[PDB]
């Protein structure tokens, strides 16, 4: 579904 944006380059996607 939806993911979170931790930092630049760090993104836990779906």
């Amino acid at each position: 579904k939806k993911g979170i944006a931790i930092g630049p380059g760090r993104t836990l996607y779906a």
């Epitope: 579904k1 939806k2 993911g3 979170i4 944006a5 931790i6 930092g7 630049p8 380059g9 760090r10 993104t11 836990l12 996607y13 779906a14």
Partner: antibody, heavy 125, light 109 residues
């Protein structure tokens, strides 16, 4: 316990550059990222960019790409924001905000809404 | 280049439920975040991750997201809720954040 303290207000001339600091305390500075948000006194919130406390990688707003440079000092636990070629449209209050999540799995500690007190810069001659 | 669209202003009566929307193309696969900024103060995070509510926020604040449209609901607002409300989310890659235009809530009477 978590706190973000910014530098004081400044004055600049059109064409100069301003640099605001943002000292962090109460958490691992390298585990979180720090945003930068500007807002004119009578306008809307604007996202500038953010930087990782550990990686140091930056992602700036496409409006401000080329003028803004966000840095950080791990030993001082302080992130910096520098904006060059200042014009009258830059007179605003500049905030620094810690990212919601930390680490590789995007967890949260005992807070997630951490904002600095704000720095009002005024470009004028 | 990514943008979040909010209504410019909404009006409500005391006790009524006010709905503030936020439309974005990446909202289907990106979370939404809401901020309340009163006149002369700093913004306050009232809703994070579409629906979750942080500690210390009144229970009358809630949010939902479906499709390319997020919504902020205030059940039984009072005069204290009269402020500006901004949207907040990321783009497709998730490296840059964008604020919404800002919705001004006005309580009547």
């Amino acid at each position: 316990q978590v706190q973000l303290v910014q530098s004081g207000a400044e004055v600049k001339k059109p064409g100069a550059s301003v640099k605001v600091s943002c000292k962090a305390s109460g958490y691992t500075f390298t585990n979180y990222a720090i945003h930068w948000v500007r807002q004119a006194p009578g306008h809307r919130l604007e996202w500038m960019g953010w930087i990782n406390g550990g990686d140091g990688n930056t992602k700036y707003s496409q409006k401000l790409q080329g003028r803004v440079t966000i840095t950080r000092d791990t030993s001082a636990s302080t992130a910096y924001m520098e904006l060059s070629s200042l014009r009258s449209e830059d007179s605003a209050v500049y905030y620094c905000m810690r990212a919601y999540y930390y680490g590789s799995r995007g967890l949260v500690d005992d807070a997630l809404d951490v904002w600095g007190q704000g720095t009002l810069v005024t470009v004028s001659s | 280049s990514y943008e979040l669209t909010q209504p410019p202003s909404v009006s409500v009566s005391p006790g009524q439920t006010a709905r503030i929307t936020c439309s974005g193309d990446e909202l289907p696969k990106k979370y939404a975040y809401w901020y309340q900024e009163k006149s002369g103060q700093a913004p306050v995070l009232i809703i994070y991750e579409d629906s979750k509510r942080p500690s210390g926020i009144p229970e009358r604040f809630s949010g939902s997201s479906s499709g390319t449209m997020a919504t902020l609901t205030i059940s039984g607002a009072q005069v204290e809720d009269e402020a500006d409300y901004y949207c907040f989310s990321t783009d497709s890659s998730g490296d840059l954040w964008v604020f919404g235009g800002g919705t001004k809530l006005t309580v009547l009477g």
